[PDB]
Amino acid sequence: APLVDNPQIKSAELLRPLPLYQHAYVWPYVIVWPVFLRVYLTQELYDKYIGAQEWTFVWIISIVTFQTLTWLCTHWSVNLNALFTAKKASSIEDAQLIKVIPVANAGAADICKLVRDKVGDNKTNISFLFQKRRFLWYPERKAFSTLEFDIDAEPKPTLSKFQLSRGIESEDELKRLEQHYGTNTFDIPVPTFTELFKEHAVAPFFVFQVFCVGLWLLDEYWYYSLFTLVMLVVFESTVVWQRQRTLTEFRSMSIKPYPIYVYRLGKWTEIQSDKLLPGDLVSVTRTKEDSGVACDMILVEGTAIVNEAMLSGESTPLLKDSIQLRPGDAVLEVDGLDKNSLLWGGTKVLQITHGPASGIPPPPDNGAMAVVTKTGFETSQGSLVRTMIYSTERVSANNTEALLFILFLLVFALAASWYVWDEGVRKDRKRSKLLLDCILIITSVVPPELPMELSLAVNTSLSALAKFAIFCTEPFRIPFAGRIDVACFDKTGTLTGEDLVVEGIAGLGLGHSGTDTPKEADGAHTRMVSVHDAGMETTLVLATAHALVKLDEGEIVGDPMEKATLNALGWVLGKNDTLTSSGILGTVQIKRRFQFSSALKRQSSVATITATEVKTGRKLRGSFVGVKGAPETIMKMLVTVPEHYEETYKYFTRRGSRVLALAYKQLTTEGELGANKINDLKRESVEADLHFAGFLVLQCPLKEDAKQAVRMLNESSHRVVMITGDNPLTAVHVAKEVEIVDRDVLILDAPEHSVYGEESLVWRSVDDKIRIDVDPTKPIDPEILKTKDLCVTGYALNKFKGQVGWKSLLRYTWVYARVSPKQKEDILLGLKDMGYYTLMAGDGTNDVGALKQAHVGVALLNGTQEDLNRIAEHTRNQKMKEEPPTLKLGDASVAAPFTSKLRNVMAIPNILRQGRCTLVATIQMYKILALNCLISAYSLSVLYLEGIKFGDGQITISGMLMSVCFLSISRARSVEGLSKERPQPNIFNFYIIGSILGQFAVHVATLIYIAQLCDQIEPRTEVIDLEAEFKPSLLNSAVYLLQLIQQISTFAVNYQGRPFRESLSENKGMFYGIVGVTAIAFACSTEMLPELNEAMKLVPFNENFKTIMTTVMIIDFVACYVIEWVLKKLFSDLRARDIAERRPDQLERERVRKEKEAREKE
Ligand code: BEF
Ligand SMILES: [Mg+2]
Structure with a gap:
């Protein structure tokens, strides 16, 4: 049985420290040094060796270099550190240090010191911090393991445990929880200049340069060697200073605590978010700017609309629900039927609403009661931060090829020195001159200036790359960009803007046919009418069906999509519940609103309208009822279904664009319905019969540079793949528009009808007429794997893990959809373990594990050239004296070796265009x-x-x-x-x-x-x-x-x-x-x-x-x-690898495009 029970840790060993007397770089050199010192000083019978100045200098240098190498071997490797510094211990009662080895590709080796706690009268805690994780010792299992919480146990806890939770009382239990779990803090170290210089000064190349420079101090010149050493020290100081500055510019991150209400000891108290413990009852309200939820919480009461922007990647708001409706004595499973209630940390709560199981008074701030389950570094974002900081060592240009090159030169150097020494001993010359000549031969063949030249050749590329606003933290990864075989890409934020924009109103031509509408084979209307030019009923529905609340000062809170609809519509709401005035020129006050229920899918409202159309002069007034919903639910309430209703919305929703249906009803044609009669109106009477208005399509707008950059990458010897976290349909459509995949496409997923607990994976088509079934044994090679392309979703990756077909699904797939943050890192590691160099260009927090483990990782921030110009103007003005919004320095640039600042997809070719040149x-x-x-x-x-x-x-x-x-x-x-x-x-x-x-x-x-x-x-x-x-x-x-x-x-x-x-x-x-x-x-x-x-x-x-x-x-x-x-x-090998071999039709199309653009270029 392994000592450390964790999948990441390979092996461990108990160690016991030793004092300075018994170290391996002190003990042999304290009994040898006096022996030579006596002979040199007061022997006067130097017959072992002649006793010239150079002869004693050789013996000085040999012992000094042996001391230095024995000291440095404890810093280069940790197994030698365990062999030299410490000794093997017996058990826990005597061990003070432990040595932990990670798995082959999840960090670096380390030695951690044990900490013993005596909180109990007869109970003690043994813990050691590896990679900022609190491993604990359990005496029963005789092994270390990570901390365990209430939500994680082999008996899943009942719903009554969380439902009847009354918070934390009994102050001694509070102290026990605080000492056992620790404070909710991240405390990123951000190392300073001294440790950076110490890490830089023990590199093999710097030590080799220092030794080669010091070997020239053989009385030949005392002024041409100290100057070189001073220059080397100055260069190594300025390099590490530049690295420290460019690291503190980006990697400096902080999480600001904010006060909250906690039901502690049966009373609601103000508590800073830094100090939270599992089992606490917390009232969650609207979050502030640039501050997410501090801890992993499960809702118990109320409903919240949140913005899962760090796991799903999208910014479309969700609808989290409580667990009051679930009955007691029920198992709390997380993968299904309750993942809508878990509230992960690091996300933003957009809105909170209530539309007493434990007998708890409501909080004064009127939030949602919830129970915190996991806190500290064990949350969902704690693992993200841990993969940010300690995941991969620096490169530092000390590869094995350089060592082999140096040895290959040193062989010839030693041969030449042997020839010279043999001739010298045959001719009986003086030994000191022979040693001088041999030292010159040795230090003239192996170059002591190679690291300087490499550093210069990389720093000039850094200075060239700084022109296009690309800033880099690890300079020696630029040569990796020359040989790239696969280029991974995100979808939202990288190739497409993250916000949802209104494409317009579609399907306005349904019903009456004008005999000019552009149709398809299945008779679906494809006309796209802008929201600026629309009819009266549709714009009144669009301005009345929203759910927006105005506060006391005047701020507007809600989903930003109706804000983006209203500011495009030109409308504006007043302090009262009214909407005021394009081309509508009217006002409307609303009276009764309904709520989105996630089961009926119907936001409906009643209002009193008065509108004066300007183009035709028609006027409308009276009462109005607006309904916005999903098309399937709205379709039943229409009294007259149009001729092509079930085709237009199907065609629009198969393109990936989100679609909504709008319906209107005129309750009373003149005046309002009346006082207090709107209050007794029921949901099954208001939504009985309506009239169609149109389909409102929302989509994420494609960037103007994605097509050209992806075309330039594809036409080269590269290969572009997409690893997103969005729906399969939208990812497939974006890949087809950008020309990542141009053929028939088959996706691998569960059937589109929601089946829960069913493990059947079926190949599907976008048109949804092919339903080839499959099982996790072997995909069919000659037809599916070769003729049609592939799209493997994240639900089929964990079912294909470890099977024989997995090695075939990482070669013939170009897009992956609905991919968790861990599976991106898994995909990139699987691609890297086949022999292909990779590159990932992300934007956000959900792909940190992909950015860190890729060879070249770019992080694209959002900011135009004008913002950079205004920042430059502001800096120049404030420097002359001795305001503009800053760039969103988020979380992707912390874990990425590179960082763009211009929001362009063309920044990815340019880096490649530099990498070759290096x-x-x-x-x-x-x-x-x-x-x-x-x-x-x-x-x-x-x-x-x-x-x-x-x-x-x-x-x-x-x-x-x-x-x-x-x-x-x-x-x-x-x-x-x-x-x-x-x-x-x-x-x-x-x-x-x-x-x-x-x-x-x-x-x-x-x-x-x-x-x-x-x-x-x-x-x-x-x-x-x-x-x-x-x-x-x-x-x-x-x-x-x-x-x-x-x-x-x-x-x-x-x-x-x-x-x-x-x-x-x-x-x-x-x-x-x-x-x-x-x-x-x-x-x-x-x-x-x-x-x-x-x-x-x-x-x-x-x-x-x-x-x-x-x-x-x-x-x-x-x-x-x-x-x-x-x-x-x-x-010579310059050709493309097997993954980038283009088909002849693609090359023919490229040649046709080239000749056509050359012909029209005249
Ligand atoms: F835009 Be992504 F999927 F991070
Ligand atoms: Mg993203």
Whole structure:
């Protein structure tokens, strides 16, 4: 049995701490250090080693580096921390620390300290905080587990327990609950500069840089090494300062407490929302701005209209109901028949209404009585916050490819050092000079400037991305954007505005036929009449059927959809229960209202009307009855059903747009009905016979940029999928409009008629004429999986979990509808565990688990360019002196590596358009560096053993050329428009290694040939000494010219231009230097300028040698290009993966569109 009983935790272990005396980085180094110290200090018989300054410095550095590595091993890994710092314990009575390991993809390893509480006389509590969860020890089960509440037990509690709950009394029980469950607080840490710098300073690359810099302190230079260390410290300080600033700008979040009424100790008291305990009786009222319900509550009395904007994703108000109507002694199941009564935390209560089981007096603020069940970090949004903060480690550019690259270079470095040391010991030279030379060889091959170059090449991309208002917190995730195989998308807020807008009034032509209405095959009217131009009866119904309440000051409370209808209609209500005055020019006062019941679906009202139409001059007045409802219920009350009633609303509701039916009745044609007769009117008399007005269609309006951005993503080698939380029909229609899916579509769900307790999954069509049944064993491959597309809903994902068909449902599906916040993370993890890199672009809180676990996660805020301009104006004005609404810095930008600020779907291609421009650079800085470094190894391994030396001017020219060409490579800007070809993803591949080895072999062969020819023409039989000054000779000129041509060629051939980044002819800083240096080299080779040869201490040349040298340089330059070209054409992987393989018809349509737009572009 596992020690920790939780699905997330893999394994645990009990530990006992040790003091500083017994640590593994103190104990071996306190008995070894004095032994060497005595020998160095007061032995005077140094026969073990000679005793020179460098010989003792080597022994100092070895022990210091061993101490540093032994200390850092406890910080790099936690298993070594458990092995070194602590020891294995026996049981709970002696353990003080515990080590917890999470599952493979749900966080990071940790060591947590145990806390013991002595609230009981003979009872104690053992708890440790892992990932801000209060794990507790239960002695009966001999295992740790999470806290348990009243609502969660293997016997489900009866309804009488919550119905008869009278709050919390008996103050000692209150103290027990407070000490056992804790306060309702979140307390996000927001780490400061010191811990960030400590975390940054123990990275392997910084330690490697510090060690490589400190190795140069071998008495050669005491002023050229401290300056580099100071520069490194300054750079690492400013990088972490920028990260801290851009992290505190966004991740700084807070939940403001608000006072509430609590029925504590049999009395209603004012209590801050920070201190709430399970079992408390809470009166819930209308919520304030930017503040949701503080805790998970279940209603007991009254009805509330809430806005589930953080679980469903939509903003359409719901109708929560109490549990008074349910009888006692009933099981409280949550999945069905009572999920309409649970009130989750973090949501906003739009309205509260009452339209005494426990004998409790009503609260003074006149809210709804409810019982809080779960509080703290165990609520529904507590898990969301936990997935925000601790879910995934930073990347920090310390991947295994860099380690393999460094080892691959270090192999050649060690080989060269071994060769040099063998020659030195054979020639019996001084050991100190040999150690100096070997240290130079070791630190010159493996590059100590690679992290600096990578950081510069990523920070320039950050500065380029900052122009389009995209701000990023983790800079080293930009290279991940180059290789993207699937792009996930949300539906509400990302591709479509979240608010519901009135499309207009439809079906006004029903009944009488004008013989010009555009119909369909099934005879459904499709005319869309704007709400601005409408008849008298329909606008009076639209202005009278609403349910709006005016307060004392004048604020209007209700569903915002009737506000958006009224302000478009131009009407306005006064302080009294009246509606005042487009083109209607009238007034109406209402008398009696009915209520939405969720069983009858009928909002009806009576009123007295007077309207004066202006276009025709007709006038109406008297009494009026307006009814708004669902079309099926309204249809029965019509006395004359029109000719095409059951087709128009069906066609409109199969498109995903919400539809409502409007009916009017004229009770008395002149004057009101009369006093007190409206009061006795019954629901079955008011809603008896009515007259049709029209269908009011509401929909979420599509953005103007979604189609173009999705088209540009699809026409590339990417693939676009949609993971929404809306209805299947609306998601299917939006996907069809945006061209995510263009074929016949089949959805996977339960039958559309509401069946509860039935597990039958059936394939359905949008037209609803195909009902192929299926069972969770295997989907049929040849027809359903191949001919028609798919749409898997969230009700079929948890029924397909673990089966063999699951691996087939993550490959042939493009949209997912009605998806819970956990299932989005599940889908993205399943896609990531197949080999595809992913990207998610969300807007809200319900997709945090998807934003965090995606490789590149963008969060789109809502704000136009004019708002940013006004914010800039306000900031400039307040800075000059030393007001506009701020951006909705919500919850998606907290958990996303990137954050847009412009509310555009085109911000997703642009990031991709930058990612390629980074990745293509990041590859070649690996290829250009290593090859150069490899050449340097040879140029210091067997060529240094020769008598060749270079003058100061030549060295300065080579260094300036190398520095300029290396600084020009990193700075790169993108090229507009995505391309069908994909860059090379990974550094370790047959193409890169083959090209590097081939070019290095060509360089080595050319150098060997020219050295043997130069020795052949004029032999040098004199002895060779390695400490002499520079001497001009023909070898010293030939080797230098060839080496300079090699340094030119490595930058000349290894450069990828037009399809991803800047062309070479546009990059002035590299091109001018390359052409100038190669012109200088060729001019010196062909002896055009006699003065130029003596300018750089270059000897005169024989006529026969000049031609063969020029030909060998030309052969080198040609072969270095030919080998790379043939390897790129043969053994390279740039094509699309199996998930993005477009069908031929789609490519044909793309070609037709391209040629048509090119033809009309003239
Ligand atoms: F708009 Be979503 F589904 F978060
Ligand atoms: Mg959303």
